[PDB]
């Protein structure tokens with residue numbers, strides 16, 4: 631199965647860099663940016679500029695329209711990277727110019743090529759201010775038109791669920807860690823020899839035209855680990871306003887330490903089926919978590935919601951038209 635992960639803009643690129651550092655295997659990684667200095671700092675193996683003419687290699691100045699133009703100008707570069715691909719993850723931090731503006735053009739180009747197109751988009755922290763969030767939400771409306779599924783993660787939910795950080799740098803490292811777990815949990819059950827592999831065909835049937843997608847993760851240790859992990863995952867969505875229990879399709883990854891036998895999945899999946907929608911179609915895989923002991927992590931990607939709505943702080947977000 632040919633899977634690619636494409637980071638778009640600075641934040642998106644940083645998440646893909648973390649995936650590389652975390653040892654993602656069996657996938658080809660790319661970083662796309664209009665800011666050439668930032669590209670030069672990355673360890674991601676494939677580094678691609680867009681927008682030389684409109685930005686001169688100096689970034690998009692927080693203007694999504696310039697990110698969009700950069701992608702359109704260089705749509706040939708994008709098509710070349712997307713050749714011979716089954717699935718692509720498009721990782722973007724929404725709220726700047728390049729991720730916000732270019733991600734929809736890359737997504738549309740992939741989807742028109744028949745590639746299973748999964749956006750992995752963050753919404754900004756509250757400390758980034760109100761204008762970055764407005765721009766993020768406007769861009770998300772274009773990204774959704776262009777994607778099979780769009781996983782939306784609100785950085786404030788990561789902060790709520792994580793240790794206090796003392797630098798903005800460290801706040802973003804926690805975001806990158808979560809995004810990396812989220813993506814590696816899907817890829818590793820398809821393209822690496824796993825505890826329980828899933829067929830790519832099943833990942834496609836789960837995510838194709840799924841639309842808004844929400845993730846929740848939970849860890850469990852010791853004797854009650856299945857119940858603890860499942861309860862935490864289902865009650866810890868990384869986007870508010872649409873409970874994981876209403877989704878009609880779900881993709882579940884069970885990470886297991888080496889000492890936990892595979893049949894832990896029997897109990898996990900019974901508990902998940904009891905908690906979520908009775909008619910949900912759920913596909914699941916299992917993969918090893920190195921360096922852990924007496925441990926599982928349950929990660930749930932929930933999609934195919936009845937309504938493509940969510941909440942950010944005190945704002946209920948709906949889009950104009952759902953295709």
Ligand SMILES: Nc1nc2c(nc(N3CCOCC3)n2[C@@H]2O[C@H](COP(=O)(O)OP(=O)(O)OP(=O)(O)O)[C@@H](O)[C@H]2O)c(=O)[nH]1
Nearest residue numbers: 639640641644689690691692723725726727728729754802
């Ligand atoms: N995963 C992840 N996300 C990050 C990271 N850093 C940021 N920002 C980017 C903005 O400055 C503060 C930190 N972001 C987020 O990226 C969002 C977009 O910023 P950007 O990716 O730097 O912007 P761009 O797509 O490069 O657009 P430009 O061409 O610079 O206008 C921000 O709102 C942040 O929430 C990071 O290291 N990892």
Ligand SMILES: [Mg+2]
Nearest residue numbers: 639640665689
């Ligand atoms: Mg930038």
